[PDB]
Design a protein around this ligand. Structure first.
Ligand code: FAD
Ligand code: FAD
Ligand code: A1H2A
Ligand code: A1H2A
Ligand code: MG
Lengths: 599, 605
C-alpha cells in the first residue's frame, strides 16, 4: 500500500512553498488539513476567533518580510466569514492564498438545484469570483498540490492579490500514490521592457531633465516590486522633490531632503501646494485613487504633464483623458531602466531644480504638518499633536499598523518614519476592525515581534474577539485606542450634509463603546489611560517598555475636527479650514482657481 | 418645488411596508438613509457593532411575530460583513431584506474594468447572487421604492428568503416628484390545489386511513406558511404519532399525547425507533436534510412509504428515488385541504392506530431523553441534565435561542416547550456566533423583551462585540455560556478520525477563551457561575428574575460526550443505520426494538 493521504501531501507542499504560518479556524471541512499540517510541524497554525481576522492577518504578514501566508477556513460560515479580508487584499494588491474546505465533492457542483450543498456548504469560489485573482475547486486528488502551487504563483505574479483554493473533505481524506501528484510549472515571467515601453522611459527622462518643477509620486507598487531601495539614489540623481502615498510612506525617510510628505483629500497643505504647482508629475507604483487626486482630473496639477507607471494596464490608463505617458511596467524594472538611462552615453543634461526645491521647503515652513488648526480643543488632547508626540517614542525597528478613523487620518497626516520602520493599514477597502488582525500578522511574521497598533473605540469592536488571540500567544502588541464617543469620522460627514443632530454615531444617537481599560483587565492585559498631557510622556515610555501585550486609551474631544481636509467642492489645493484668499493667491503660481475666489 | 429626497421616500416606503426595525451600521454609503429614517420616526434603527449581527438579527426578528426586518448596510466592508447572515437566512428559508449602499452610480456597473468601484465599492449584488432570492441595483431614482416593495414581496413569496437591494449613494440623495415614483404590484398568489395536487391529497388521505403505524414529520415550513395552529386538530383527527424537526420544535407542545420528539443523526433514541419502525411517513414543511434522514435513503424507515410536502419543487423531489407522493404545495393549503377531506360527510374510515401509539409511548419509556448515558462525568455537571433542570425554569412565554456546540445539541435533544414558547437557531448554515445576534432580533421584536440565549465559549467569540449592543439598550437577554475548554464538538470529530492529541480545539492546542464572568463585569453585566448542583437552582432563579442582561457560565467536562448520536463504529468501519445510535445498546435489545429485526449492519457491532 504505497498511498499517501492527500492532506499530508498538501502539508508537504506548503513547506516546499515556504508557507510558515497559517491562520484560520478548524472545522469538519478542514479537520484533515489541520491534522496533517500540525503533525508535519513546519507550518504554524494560528487559531483566530473569526475567520475575517485570518484573511486580514495574512496580508500584513506578507507586507512585513515578503513571505506569503495561508488562511485555513472551513465549510460554510468558515468561508463566508473570510470574504471581507479577501476584498481588502484584493483592493490593496496584497498576495495571500485561502485554502477553504467544503462538503463531499458529490455535492459541490454549481448545477446543484438545492439552495445549499450537502449539510451546510456553498460555492465559495463563486462568492469571491470578482474579488480575487484566481479560484479553483479541486475535484481530483492528483491536482490538489497543483492548484496550491498555481494559487500561490498567481497570487504573487503581476499585480498581487488573493487566491481561493477550495478542497472538499473527501479530497482531503483521500489517498493516492505520491508519484501521481501533478505539479504546476509557472509560465515564463514577462519582459516588460519592450521597445515601446523603453521609448516611454526615454520620454520620461526627457521631461525630467527639462522640468523646472518636477514631482515624483511614489506608491506601494514600488515596495511590492521590491525596488524601494532604488528610491534614495533615484531622487538624489534627479534632484527632484517627491511625494509618497499613504501606503508607501515607509519606503523613504520622511525627513529626507527631497521627500515632502503626502498629498490628497486628506493631504498636507505643503504637499498639496507642491503637487498643484508642479510642471511635471511622475507617478510610480501609486494607484492615484480618488482620495489622492480629488474629484476632477482637470483640476489636478493644472500646470503639469502627468505620466503614470503601473503594472496593471487598467489602472495605468484610467486617467488617460488627463495623463500623457501611460507606462504599463513593473515599478522596479522601470526604476532600473530609468537609472540606467541616467548613466547612458547620450544621457541628457538634468536642468537644475534648486529654485523648485527651495520653494518646496518654503511651503513646509509656511504650512507645518501640525499647525495652529490642531490646537487642543477645550483642553482635550488633539490627536494630531498626540501623533507628533508619540512619534518620538518609535523604536528603531518600529512597525505601526492602524485602523480607520482617527488612527488612520491623524497617523498618515503627521507620523514620520525612517529606514527600518514600517507603516501598514488597509486603505483600498478601508474596513473597520483591521488594526488588530493587522498586528497579529506583523507579530507572527517577526516571530512574535513587537507591533504598535493605533486603533479607535469604534473599529475596536469589529474584531474585538482577537484580544483573546493576543493574550493566548503573549504578543507584544501595543494597542492605542482613541476614544471619542463613537464614529467621529461619520459625525463630520452627517454634520456637513444635514447640520442637525447626530444619527447612529454617538452614545446619545445609539452607538456606545465599552471601557477598554476594564476590558483589558478582563483579558489580563495591562492598561493605561492618557487623558491629558500631564501623564503623557511617562505613560508612552512605559507602553514601549512593556514586553507583552498592553492597552492604552487616548481620550480626545468627541467632536475634534479632522484637518486639513478637502471639504464642501473646491480644488485640491484649497483645503479646509480655508486659508485667507490673499495667502492662497501668493501660494499658487498662476493665481488661485476661479472656484477659490468667491469662497 | 414639489420634489422630495429619494431617501425620504424610502423611509416613507418602509412605513407602508410595515418595517418597524432596521439593524445595521452607518457609513457614507447609507448616511442619507440613516438620516431620512431617523427623522421620520417610524422605523427604529438598531446600531450593531458588526454588520454580520445585523443580517442575523433580522431573521429571528421575523420568526418572532412574523414582521419582516431590514438590514441597513453601507459601502464596501459594510456589505461584505453581512454575507454570513444572508447565507443563514437563505439556508433556513427566513425572509428579510438587505438595503445596502454603494458608491456613486457612475462607478457601479459590472463592466467597470477596475478592481473596485469608486473609492471602496464593489458588486454587492453579484456576491450574494447564489445565496439570495433577488438582487437588484437601483439605478433610477423613480425605481427606488419599486425595488423595495418588490424586494419585500419576493422575500416572503413561496419559499421565503433574503433579498438584496443596492441603492447607490447619489440615488439616495437625489430629488424627484413623488408622483413619478413607480410602484410594484404583486401578482396573484398561485393556487396550489390543481386537479393533480388534489389527487395527491386524496392519495395521502387514503394511505393515512389505511396505515397501521403512521408518522407525521412536521417542519418549520408549516410555521412559515402560517398553519401551525392547524396541527392540533389534524393530529387528533388522524390519531397518528408525529415527530417535529429541530426547526419546528415549538409548533406543538412537546408533551402532547401524540408528539414523540425529534429524530435524526442527533435524534432521540425513542424518536429514531418510531421513525424507523413505521409503515407510512408524511413529511410536511420539513426539508428532510442529511442530519434528519442519515446518509442512505435505502436505510430510512425501510418498512414505510414516504410522502413529502414542500413548497419548493426541488426540495420536494430530491428524494424521488425513495419517496412516493412528492407534493409541491404550501404547507397551510395542504393541511387545510387534508382537513376539508377529513371533515367531509364522505370522509373515509380511519383505521385505529391505538396499538402503534401505545408502542410509541413504550419507546419513550424504554429510552428517556436524558438517560443513564447522561450521567455526571468525573464530578462535572452533564450538559444534558443541566438542560433538563434549566427547562423547569422556563417562563410561560419563554423564548430560547441557541448558538452551536453544546447549546445546540444538548438543547434540541432535551428541552421541552409549551404553547406560547419559542425555540430558534440557525440550522441550515450552522454558523458559530448566531446566539447573541439571535437574541437581539427576538428582543427588539417583542419591544425589548426577554430572551434566553444558550451560547458556548467558542461561539461567543465570533460576535462578542454585541455584548455592548445588549448593555446599550438594556436588553433583558439571559446569556448562558457552556465552558468546555474550546471546541468540544470538533474534539469528538478529530478524536474519532485520528485518536491522537487535539489540534486547534483547546487551550493547549491553540484555542483559548476568556473568563466571561470577568468580561461581563467589564461590560457592567451581572454574572453568575454554575459548577455544581448545590447552587444550581438558586442561580437559575436569580438569572430569570433579573430585569436586564445577565451572563451565567456553566462549566462542563472538557471532553463530555454528545449522545445519542449516529457515529461510525469499528467492527473495518461501518456507518450503522439511523436507528443504531451511539453509544450502542445491546444487540438483543435492538433486536426486540425493531419490528422486523435489526439491519444487517447492526448484527456485527
Ligand atoms: C479616508 C481615506 C483618506 C485617504 N487620504 C489619502 C490622502 O490624502 N493621500 C494619499 O496619498 N492617500 C490617501 N488615502 C489612501 C489612498 O486613497 C489609497 O488607498 C492608497 O493608500 C494610496 O497608496 P498606493 O497607491 O501606494 O496604494 P495602492 O492603492 O495599493 O496602490 C498600488 C498600485 O500599484 C500597482 N502595483 C502593484 N504591484 C506593482 C508592481 N510590481 N509594479 C508596479 N505597480 C504595481 C497596483 O496595481 C496599484 O495600482 C486615503 C484613504 C482613505 C480611506
Ligand atoms: C449539527 C446538527 C445536527 C442536527 N441534528 C438534527 C437532528 O437530529 N434532527 C433534526 O430533525 N434536525 C437536526 N438538525 C437540523 C436539520 O438538519 C435542519 O437544519 C433543519 O433544522 C430541519 O428542520 P426544518 O426542515 O423544519 O428546517 P428547514 O431546513 O428550514 O426546512 C424548511 C423546509 O420547508 C419548506 N418550506 C418553506 N416555506 C414553506 C411553505 N410556505 N410551505 C411549505 N413548505 C415550505 C422549505 O422549502 C424547506 O424545504 C441538525 C443540524 C445541525 C447543524
Ligand atoms: C473609512 C471610513 C468609512 O469607511 C467611510 O464611511 O468612509 C467609515 S469610518 C466609520 C467610523 C469609524 O469610527 P471609529 O472607528 O470610532 O473612528 P473615529 O472615532 O476616529 O471616527 C465608519 C463606520 N465607516 C464606514 C464603515 C462601516 N463599517 C465598516 C466595517 N467599515 C467602514 N469603513
Ligand atoms: C455544525 C457545527 C460546526 O460547523 C461543524 O463543523 O460541525 C462547527 S462546531 C465548532 C466548535 C464549536 O465550539 P463551541 O462554540 O465552543 O461549542 P462546543 O463547546 O459545544 O463545541 C466549529 C468550529 N464548527 C465549524 C465552524 C467554524 N467556524 C464557524 C464560523 N462556524 C462553524 N460552524
Ligand atoms: Mg465550547
Amino acid at each position: 500500500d504505497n498511498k499517501v493521504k492527500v492532506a499530508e501531501l498538501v502539508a508537504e507542499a506548503l513547506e516546499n512553498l515556504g508557507i510558515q504560518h497559517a491562520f484560520g479556524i478548524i472545522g469538519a471541512g478542514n479537520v484533515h488539513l489541520f491534522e496533517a499540517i500540525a503533525r508535519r510541524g513546519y507550518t504554524e497554525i494560528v487559531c483566530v476567533h473569526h475567520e475575517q481576522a485570518a484573511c486580514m492577518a495574512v496580508q500584513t504578514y506578507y507586507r512585513t518580510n515578503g513571505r506569503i501566508a495561508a488562511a485555513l477556513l472551513t465549510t460554510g460560515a468558515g468561508s463566508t466569514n473570510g470574504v471581507t479580508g479577501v476584498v481588502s487584499a484584493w483592493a490593496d494588491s496584497i498576495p495571500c492564498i485561502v485554502i477553504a474546505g467544503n462538503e463531499n465533492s458529490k455535492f459541490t457542483f454549481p448545477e446543484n438545484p438545492l439552495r445549499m450543498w450537502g449539510v451546510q456548504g456553498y460555492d465559495s469560489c463563486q462568492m469571491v469570483e470578482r474579488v480575487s485573482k484566481y479560484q479553483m475547486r479541486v475535484t481530483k486528488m492528483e491536482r490538489a498540490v497543483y492548484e496550491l502551487e498555481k494559487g500561490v504563483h498567481l497570487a504573487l505574479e503581476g499585480r498581487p492579490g488573493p487566491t481561493w483554493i477550495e478542497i472538499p473533505m473527501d479530497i482531503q481524506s483521500g489517498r493516492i500514490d505520491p508519484a501521481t501528484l501533478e505539479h504546476y510549472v509557472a509560465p515564463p515571467a514577462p519582459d516588460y521592457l519592450t521597445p515601446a515601453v523603453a521609448a516611454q522611459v526615454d520620454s520620461v527622462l526627457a521631461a525630467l531633465a527639462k522640468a523646472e518643477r518636477p514631482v515624483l509620486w511614489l506608491g506601494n507598487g514600488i515596495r511590492l516590486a521590491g525596488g524601494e531601495r532604488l528610491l534614495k539614489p533615484l531622487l538624489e540623481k534627479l534632484g527632484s522633490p517627491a511625494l509618497v502615498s499613504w501606503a508607501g510612506i515607509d519606503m523613504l525617510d520622511s525627513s529626507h531632503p527631497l521627500v515632502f510628505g503626502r498629498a490628497g483629500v486628506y493631504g498636507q497643505r505643503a504637499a498639496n501646494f507642491i503637487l498643484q504647482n508642479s510642471d511635471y508629475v511622475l507617478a510610480i507604483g501609486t494607484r492615484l485613487a480618488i482620495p489622492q487626486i480629488g474629484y476632477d482630473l482637470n483640476e489636478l496639477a493644472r500646470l503639469a504633464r502627468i505620466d503614470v507607471v503601473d503594472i496593471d494596464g487598467d489602472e495605468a490608463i484610467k486617467h488617460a483623458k488627463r495623463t500623457q505617458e501611460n507606462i504599463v511596467c513593473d515599478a522596479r524594472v522601470f526604476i532600473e531602466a530609468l537609472l540606467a538611462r541616467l548613466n547612458a552615453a547620450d544621457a541628457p543634461a538634468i536642468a537644475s531644480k534648486a529654485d523648485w526645491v527651495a520653494k518646496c521647503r518654503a511651503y513646509e515652513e509656511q504650512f507645518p504638518w501640525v499647525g495652529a488648526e490642531h490646537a487642543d480643543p477645550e483642553g482635550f488632547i488633539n490627536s494630531y499633536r498626540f501623533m507628533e508626540r508619540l512619534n518620538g517614542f518609535f523604536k528603531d525597528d518600529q512597525v505601526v499598523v492602524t485602523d480607520m478613523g482617527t488612527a488612520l487620518l491623524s497617523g498618515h497626516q503627521v507620523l514620520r518614519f525612517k529606514e527600518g520602520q514600517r507603516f501598514m493599514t488597509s486603505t483600498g477597502l478601508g474596513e473597520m476592525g483591521y488594526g488588530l488582525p493587522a498586528a497579529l500578522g506583523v507579530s507572527f511574521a517577526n516571530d512574535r515581534g513587537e507591533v504598535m497598533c493605533l486603533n479607535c473605540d469604534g473599529g475596536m469592536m469589529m474584531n474585538l474577539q482577537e484580544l483573546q488571540t493576543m493574550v493566548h500567544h503573549n504578543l507584544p502588541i501595543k494597542l492605542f485606542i482613541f476614544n471619542n464617543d463613537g464614529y467621529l469620522m461619520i459625525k463630520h460627514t452627517q454634520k456637513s450634509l444635514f447640520k442637525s443632530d447626530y444619527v447612529g454615531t454617538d452614545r446619545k444617537s445609539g452607538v456606545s463603546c465599552p471601557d477598554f481599560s476594564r476590558l483589558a483587565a478582563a483579558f489580563d492585559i495591562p492598561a493605561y489611560q492618557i487623558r491629558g498631557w500631564d501623564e503623557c510622556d511617562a505613560t508612552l515610555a512605559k507602553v514601549q517598555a512593556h514586553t507583552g501585550p498592553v492597552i492604552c486609551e487616548v481620550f480626545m474631544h468627541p467632536q475634534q475636527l479632522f484637518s486639513p481636509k478637502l471639504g464642501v467642492s473646491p480644488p485640491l489645493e484649497d483645503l479646509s479650514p480655508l486659508i485667507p484668499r490673499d495667502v492662497l493667491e501668493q501660494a499658487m503660481i498662476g493665481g488661485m482657481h476661479e472656484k477659490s475666489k468667491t469662497l
